[PDB]
Coordinates of C-alpha atoms and ligand atoms in Angstrom, one line a residue:
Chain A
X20 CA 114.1 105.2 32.8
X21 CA 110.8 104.3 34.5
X22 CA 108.8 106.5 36.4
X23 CA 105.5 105.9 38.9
X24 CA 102.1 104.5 38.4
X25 CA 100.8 106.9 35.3
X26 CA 103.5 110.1 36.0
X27 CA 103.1 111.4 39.4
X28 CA 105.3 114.8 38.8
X29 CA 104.5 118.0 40.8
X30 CA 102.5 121.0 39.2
X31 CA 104.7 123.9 40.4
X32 CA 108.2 124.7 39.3
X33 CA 109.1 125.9 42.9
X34 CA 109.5 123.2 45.4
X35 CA 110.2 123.7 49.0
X36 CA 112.5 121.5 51.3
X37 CA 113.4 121.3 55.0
X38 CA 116.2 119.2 56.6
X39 CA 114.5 118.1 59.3
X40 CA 117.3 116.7 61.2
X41 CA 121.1 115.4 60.9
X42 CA 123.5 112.4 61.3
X43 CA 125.9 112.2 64.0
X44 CA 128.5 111.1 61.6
X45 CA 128.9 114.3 59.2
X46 CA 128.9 118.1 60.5
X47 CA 125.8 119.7 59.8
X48 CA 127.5 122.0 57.0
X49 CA 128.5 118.8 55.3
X50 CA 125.1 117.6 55.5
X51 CA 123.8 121.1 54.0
X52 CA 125.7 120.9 51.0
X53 CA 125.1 117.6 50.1
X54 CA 122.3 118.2 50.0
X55 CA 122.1 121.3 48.0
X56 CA 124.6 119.7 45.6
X57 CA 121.7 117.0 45.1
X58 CA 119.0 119.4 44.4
X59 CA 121.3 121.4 42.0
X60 CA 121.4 118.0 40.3
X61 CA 117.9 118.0 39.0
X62 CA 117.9 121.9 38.9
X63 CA 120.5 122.5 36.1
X64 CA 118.7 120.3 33.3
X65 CA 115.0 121.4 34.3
X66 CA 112.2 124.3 35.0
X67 CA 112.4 123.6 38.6
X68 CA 113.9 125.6 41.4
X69 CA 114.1 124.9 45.4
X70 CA 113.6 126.4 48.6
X71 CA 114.9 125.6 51.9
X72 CA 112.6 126.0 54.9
X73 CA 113.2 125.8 58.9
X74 CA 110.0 125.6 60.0
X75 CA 106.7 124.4 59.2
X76 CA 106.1 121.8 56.3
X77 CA 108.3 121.4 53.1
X78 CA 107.5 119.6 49.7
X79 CA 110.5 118.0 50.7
X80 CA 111.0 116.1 54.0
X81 CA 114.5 115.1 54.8
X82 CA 115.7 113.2 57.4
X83 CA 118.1 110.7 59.0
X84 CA 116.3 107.4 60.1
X85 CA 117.3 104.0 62.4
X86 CA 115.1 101.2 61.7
X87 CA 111.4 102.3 62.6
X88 CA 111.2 105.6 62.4
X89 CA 107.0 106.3 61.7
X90 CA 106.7 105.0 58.1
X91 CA 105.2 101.8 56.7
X92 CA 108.7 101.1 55.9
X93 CA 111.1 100.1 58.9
X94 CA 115.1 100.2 57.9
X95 CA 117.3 97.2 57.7
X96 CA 120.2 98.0 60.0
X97 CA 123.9 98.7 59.1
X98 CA 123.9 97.5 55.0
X99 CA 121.4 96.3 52.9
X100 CA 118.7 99.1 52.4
X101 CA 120.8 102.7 52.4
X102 CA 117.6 104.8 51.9
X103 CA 114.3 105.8 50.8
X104 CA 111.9 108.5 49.1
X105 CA 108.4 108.9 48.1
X106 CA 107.1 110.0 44.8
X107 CA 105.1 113.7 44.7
X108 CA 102.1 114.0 46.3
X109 CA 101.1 115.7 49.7
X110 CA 102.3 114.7 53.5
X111 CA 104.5 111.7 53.2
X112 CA 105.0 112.2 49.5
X113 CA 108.3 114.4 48.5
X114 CA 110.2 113.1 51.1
X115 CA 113.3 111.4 51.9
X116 CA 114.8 109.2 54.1
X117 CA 118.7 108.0 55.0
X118 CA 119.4 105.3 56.7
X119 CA 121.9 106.3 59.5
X120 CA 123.2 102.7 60.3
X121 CA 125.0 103.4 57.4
X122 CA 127.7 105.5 57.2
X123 CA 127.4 108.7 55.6
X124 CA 130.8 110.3 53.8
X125 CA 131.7 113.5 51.9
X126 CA 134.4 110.9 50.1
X127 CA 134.3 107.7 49.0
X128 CA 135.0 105.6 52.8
X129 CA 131.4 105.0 53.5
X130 CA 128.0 105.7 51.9
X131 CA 128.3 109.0 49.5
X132 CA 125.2 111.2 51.4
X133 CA 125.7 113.1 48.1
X134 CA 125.4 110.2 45.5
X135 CA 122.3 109.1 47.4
X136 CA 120.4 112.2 47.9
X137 CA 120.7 112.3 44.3
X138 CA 119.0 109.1 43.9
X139 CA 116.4 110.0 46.6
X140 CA 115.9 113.1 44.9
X141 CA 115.3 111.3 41.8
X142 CA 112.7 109.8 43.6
X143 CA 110.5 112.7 45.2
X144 CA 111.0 114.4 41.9
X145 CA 108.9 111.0 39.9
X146 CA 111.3 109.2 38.6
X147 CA 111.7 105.3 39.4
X148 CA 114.2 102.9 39.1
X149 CA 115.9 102.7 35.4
X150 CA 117.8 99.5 33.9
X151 CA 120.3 101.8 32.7
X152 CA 123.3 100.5 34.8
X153 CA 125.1 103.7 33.8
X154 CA 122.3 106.0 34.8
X155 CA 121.6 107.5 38.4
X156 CA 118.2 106.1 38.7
X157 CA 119.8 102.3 39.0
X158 CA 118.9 101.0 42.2
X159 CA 122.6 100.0 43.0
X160 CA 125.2 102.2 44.6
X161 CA 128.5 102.3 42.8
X162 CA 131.4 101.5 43.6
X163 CA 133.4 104.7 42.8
X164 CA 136.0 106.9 43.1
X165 CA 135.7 110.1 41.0
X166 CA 132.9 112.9 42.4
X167 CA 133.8 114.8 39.4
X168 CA 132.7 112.6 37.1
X169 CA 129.0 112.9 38.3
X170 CA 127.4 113.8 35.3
X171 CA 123.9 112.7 35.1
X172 CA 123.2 110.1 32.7
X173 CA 121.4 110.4 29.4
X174 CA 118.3 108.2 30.6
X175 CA 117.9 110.6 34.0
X176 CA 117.9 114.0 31.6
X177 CA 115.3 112.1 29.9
X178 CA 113.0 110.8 31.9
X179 CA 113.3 113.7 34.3
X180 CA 112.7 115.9 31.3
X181 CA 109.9 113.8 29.7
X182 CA 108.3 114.6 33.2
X183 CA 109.2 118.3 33.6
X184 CA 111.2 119.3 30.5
X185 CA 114.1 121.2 30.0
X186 CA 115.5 124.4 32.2
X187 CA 114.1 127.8 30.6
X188 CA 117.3 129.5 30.2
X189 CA 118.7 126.5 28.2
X190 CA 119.0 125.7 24.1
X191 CA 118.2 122.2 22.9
X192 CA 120.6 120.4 21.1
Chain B
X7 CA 110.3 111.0 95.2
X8 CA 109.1 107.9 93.3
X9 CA 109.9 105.2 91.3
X10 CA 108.1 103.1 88.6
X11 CA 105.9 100.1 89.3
X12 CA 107.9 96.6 89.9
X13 CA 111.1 99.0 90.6
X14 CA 112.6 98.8 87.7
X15 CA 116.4 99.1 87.4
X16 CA 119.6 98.7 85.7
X17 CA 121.4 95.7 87.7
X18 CA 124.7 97.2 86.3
X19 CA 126.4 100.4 86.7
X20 CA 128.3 101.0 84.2
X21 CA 125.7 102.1 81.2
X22 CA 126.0 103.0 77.9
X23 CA 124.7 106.1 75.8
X24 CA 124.1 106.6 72.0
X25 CA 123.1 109.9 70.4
X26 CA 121.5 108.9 67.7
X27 CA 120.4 112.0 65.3
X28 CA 120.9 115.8 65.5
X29 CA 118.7 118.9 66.5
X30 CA 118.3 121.7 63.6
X31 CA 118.1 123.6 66.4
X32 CA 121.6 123.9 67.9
X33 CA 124.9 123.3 67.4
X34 CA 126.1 119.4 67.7
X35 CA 128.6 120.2 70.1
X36 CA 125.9 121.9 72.6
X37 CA 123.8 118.8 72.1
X38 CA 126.6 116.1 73.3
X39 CA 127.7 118.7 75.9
X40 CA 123.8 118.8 77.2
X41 CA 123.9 114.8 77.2
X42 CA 127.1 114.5 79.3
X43 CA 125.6 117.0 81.2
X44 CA 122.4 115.6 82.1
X45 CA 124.6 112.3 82.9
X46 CA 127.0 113.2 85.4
X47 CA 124.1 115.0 87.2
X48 CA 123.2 111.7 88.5
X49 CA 127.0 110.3 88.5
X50 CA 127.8 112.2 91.0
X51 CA 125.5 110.9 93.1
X52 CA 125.5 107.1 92.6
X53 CA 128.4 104.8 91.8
X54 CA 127.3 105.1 88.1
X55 CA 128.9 105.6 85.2
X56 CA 128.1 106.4 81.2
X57 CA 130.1 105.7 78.0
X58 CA 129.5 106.7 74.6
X59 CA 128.9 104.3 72.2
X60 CA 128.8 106.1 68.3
X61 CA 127.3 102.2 66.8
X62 CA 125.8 99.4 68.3
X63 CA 122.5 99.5 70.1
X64 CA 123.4 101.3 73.8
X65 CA 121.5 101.5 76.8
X66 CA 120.6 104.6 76.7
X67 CA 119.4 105.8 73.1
X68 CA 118.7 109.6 73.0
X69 CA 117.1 110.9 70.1
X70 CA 115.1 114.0 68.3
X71 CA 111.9 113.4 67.6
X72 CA 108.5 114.8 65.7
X73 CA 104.9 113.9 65.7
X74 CA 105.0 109.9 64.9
X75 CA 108.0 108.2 65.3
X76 CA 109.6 104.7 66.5
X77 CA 106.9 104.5 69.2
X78 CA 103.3 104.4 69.8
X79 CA 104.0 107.8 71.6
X80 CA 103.8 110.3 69.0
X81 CA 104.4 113.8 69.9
X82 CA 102.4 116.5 69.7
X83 CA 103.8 119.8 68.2
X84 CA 105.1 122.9 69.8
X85 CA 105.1 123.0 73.5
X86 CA 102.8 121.0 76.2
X87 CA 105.0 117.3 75.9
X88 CA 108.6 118.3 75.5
X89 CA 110.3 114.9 75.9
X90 CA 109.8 111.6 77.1
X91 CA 111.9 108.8 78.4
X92 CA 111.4 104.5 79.4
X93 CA 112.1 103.5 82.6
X94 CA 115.0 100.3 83.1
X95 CA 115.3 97.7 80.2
X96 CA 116.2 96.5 77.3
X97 CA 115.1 98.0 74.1
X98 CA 113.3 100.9 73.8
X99 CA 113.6 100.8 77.5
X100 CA 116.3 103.2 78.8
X101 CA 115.8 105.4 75.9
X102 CA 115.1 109.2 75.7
X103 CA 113.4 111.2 72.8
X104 CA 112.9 114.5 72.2
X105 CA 110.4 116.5 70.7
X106 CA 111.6 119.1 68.0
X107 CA 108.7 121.0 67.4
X108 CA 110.4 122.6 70.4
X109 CA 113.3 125.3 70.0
X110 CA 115.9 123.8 72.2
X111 CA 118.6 125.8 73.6
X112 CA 121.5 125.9 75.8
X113 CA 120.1 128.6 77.4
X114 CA 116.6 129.6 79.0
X115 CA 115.7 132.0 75.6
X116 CA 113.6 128.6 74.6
X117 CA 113.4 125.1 75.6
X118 CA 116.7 124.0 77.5
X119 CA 118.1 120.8 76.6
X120 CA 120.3 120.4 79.5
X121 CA 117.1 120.8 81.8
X122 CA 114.9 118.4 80.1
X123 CA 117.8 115.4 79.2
X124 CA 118.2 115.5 83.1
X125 CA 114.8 114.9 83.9
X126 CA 114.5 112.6 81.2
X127 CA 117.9 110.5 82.1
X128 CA 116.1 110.3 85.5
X129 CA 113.3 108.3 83.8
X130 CA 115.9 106.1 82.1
X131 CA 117.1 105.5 85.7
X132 CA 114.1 104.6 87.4
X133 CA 112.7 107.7 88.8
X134 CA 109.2 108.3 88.1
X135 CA 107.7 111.7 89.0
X136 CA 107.9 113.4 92.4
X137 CA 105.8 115.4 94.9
X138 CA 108.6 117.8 95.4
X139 CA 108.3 121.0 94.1
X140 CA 111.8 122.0 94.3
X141 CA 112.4 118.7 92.6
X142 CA 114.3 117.8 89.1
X143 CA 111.8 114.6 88.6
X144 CA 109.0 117.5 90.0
X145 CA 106.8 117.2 86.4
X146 CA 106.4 120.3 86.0
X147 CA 109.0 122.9 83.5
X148 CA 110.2 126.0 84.7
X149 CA 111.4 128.6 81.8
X150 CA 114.3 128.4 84.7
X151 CA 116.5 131.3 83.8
X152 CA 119.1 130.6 87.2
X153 CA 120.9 127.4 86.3
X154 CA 123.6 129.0 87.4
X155 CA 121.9 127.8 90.8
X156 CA 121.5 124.6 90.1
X157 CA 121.2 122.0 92.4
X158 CA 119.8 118.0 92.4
X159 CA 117.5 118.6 94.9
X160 CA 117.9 116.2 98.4
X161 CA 114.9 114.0 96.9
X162 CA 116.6 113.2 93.4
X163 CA 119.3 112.1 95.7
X164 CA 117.5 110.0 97.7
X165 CA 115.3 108.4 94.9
X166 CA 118.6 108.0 93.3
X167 CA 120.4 106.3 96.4
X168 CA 117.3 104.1 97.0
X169 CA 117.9 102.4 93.7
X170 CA 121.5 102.2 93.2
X171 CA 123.7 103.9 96.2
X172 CA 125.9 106.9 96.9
X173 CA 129.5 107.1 95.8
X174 CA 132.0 104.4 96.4
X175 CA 133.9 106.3 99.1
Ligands
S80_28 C1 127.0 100.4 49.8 O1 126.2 99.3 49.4 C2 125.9 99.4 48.0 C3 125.0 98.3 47.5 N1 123.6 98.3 48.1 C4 123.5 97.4 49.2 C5 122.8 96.0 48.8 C6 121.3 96.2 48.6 C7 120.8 97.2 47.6 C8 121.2 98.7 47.8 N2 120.3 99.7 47.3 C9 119.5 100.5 48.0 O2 119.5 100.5 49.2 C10 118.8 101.7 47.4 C11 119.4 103.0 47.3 C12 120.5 103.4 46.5 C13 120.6 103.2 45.0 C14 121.4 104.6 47.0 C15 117.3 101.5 47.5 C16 116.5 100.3 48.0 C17 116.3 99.4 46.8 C18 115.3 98.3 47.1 O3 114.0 98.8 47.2 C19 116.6 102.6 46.7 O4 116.6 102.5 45.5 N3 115.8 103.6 47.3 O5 115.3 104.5 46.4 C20 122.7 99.1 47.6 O6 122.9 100.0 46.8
CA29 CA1 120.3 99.8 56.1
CA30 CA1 106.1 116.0 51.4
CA31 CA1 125.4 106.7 60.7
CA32 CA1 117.6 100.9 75.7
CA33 CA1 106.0 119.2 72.0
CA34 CA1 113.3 122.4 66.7
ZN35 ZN1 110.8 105.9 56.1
ZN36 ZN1 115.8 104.2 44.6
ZN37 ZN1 108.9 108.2 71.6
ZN38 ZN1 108.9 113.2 83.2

């Protein structure tokens, strides 16, 4: 693992987040659930728990993005760059961007909105990106077949957990 | 009615639309139907006509938008600006955005999208605003409970015609 410039982590266990709009290519449901599949991620193996907001201004900022969108940081079309998330901090920090010239899938057809939001998630949570091919923090997207064998990798539960530590509930091995 | 400075138009009539996110706010189905909506509003009037591209840049981009965004035209929170459109062009010309800090609806309970991506699309046609008070490029939003009245006025019309014609036959 690496994480950001001396260990920007948030200070509360309770973070809020807010969709803030959706993709033409996926119903809104399949949207939804990707997305709380990606929080429930980072959720089972640490202290911290999420919200989901409507209105008004989230830890959290998620949207879908073509090219320039208000960042510093335009998108590159259909390939290259699939997304992009900020580490914690106010405003602009938390949040998370997908880039919808790319195609996002509840399969494996075009970009996983899952597998990503994880990654982005990784992101607005501290973490950076790892060497560790095998672990979710590598800034390459996979190609893969099996959903069900997303497990996180051993160098996300521990940088993630160096950051934040382990849920309350759970025993250490 | 009016149109922009240097007249501004498409020197084609058969345009293209992309939607290119979705509203929180409403059902996706209500947004397209709102879109195709606001289109043939001005179809029937001109020999026009709109098909939806899903990639690709198209003429028409419509999108949902808040505060700072792909232009230097941020928007400004709940109510006053509700949307705003480019006249004729390439580009961000031709394109529509909308403002999210509104509650849009497909009825009058807040901000109607149908409404507002007419007045727009008139923009992105070459309308600017009109005099008219009883017009749809009139400036000025009514909470306007009777669509079930709703007309073009006769000045959309002839704004409209001015630029690109009635009908064929
Ligand atoms: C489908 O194409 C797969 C190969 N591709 C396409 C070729 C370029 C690289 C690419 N990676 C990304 O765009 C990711 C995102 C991923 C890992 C989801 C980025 C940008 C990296 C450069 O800064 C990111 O890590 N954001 O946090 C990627 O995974
Ligand atoms: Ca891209
Ligand atoms: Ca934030
Ligand atoms: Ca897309
Ligand atoms: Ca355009
Ligand atoms: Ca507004
Ligand atoms: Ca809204
Ligand atoms: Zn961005
Ligand atoms: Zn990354
Ligand atoms: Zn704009
Ligand atoms: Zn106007």
């Amino acid at each position: 693992f690496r994480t950001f410039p001396g260990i920007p982590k948030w200070r509360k266990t309770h973070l809020t987040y807010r969709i803030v709009n959706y993709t033409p290519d996926l119903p809104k449901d399949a949207v939804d659930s990707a997305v709380e599949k990606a929080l429930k991620v980072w959720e089972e193996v640490t202290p911290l728990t999420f919200s989901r907001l409507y209105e008004g201004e989230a830890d959290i900022m998620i949207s879908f993005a073509v090219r320039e969108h208000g960042d510093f940081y335009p998108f590159d079309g259909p390939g290259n760059v699939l997304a992009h998330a900020y580490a914690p901090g106010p405003g602009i920090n938390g949040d998370a961007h997908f880039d919808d010239d790319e195609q996002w899938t509840k399969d494996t057809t075009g970009t996983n909105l899952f597998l990503v939001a994880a990654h982005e998630i990784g992101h607005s949570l501290g973490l950076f990106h790892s060497a560790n091919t095998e672990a979710l923090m590598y800034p390459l997207y996979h190609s893969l077949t099996d959903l069900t064998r997303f497990r996180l990798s051993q160098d996300d539960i521990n940088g993630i957990q160096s950051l934040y530590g382990p849920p309350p509930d759970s025993p250490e091995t």
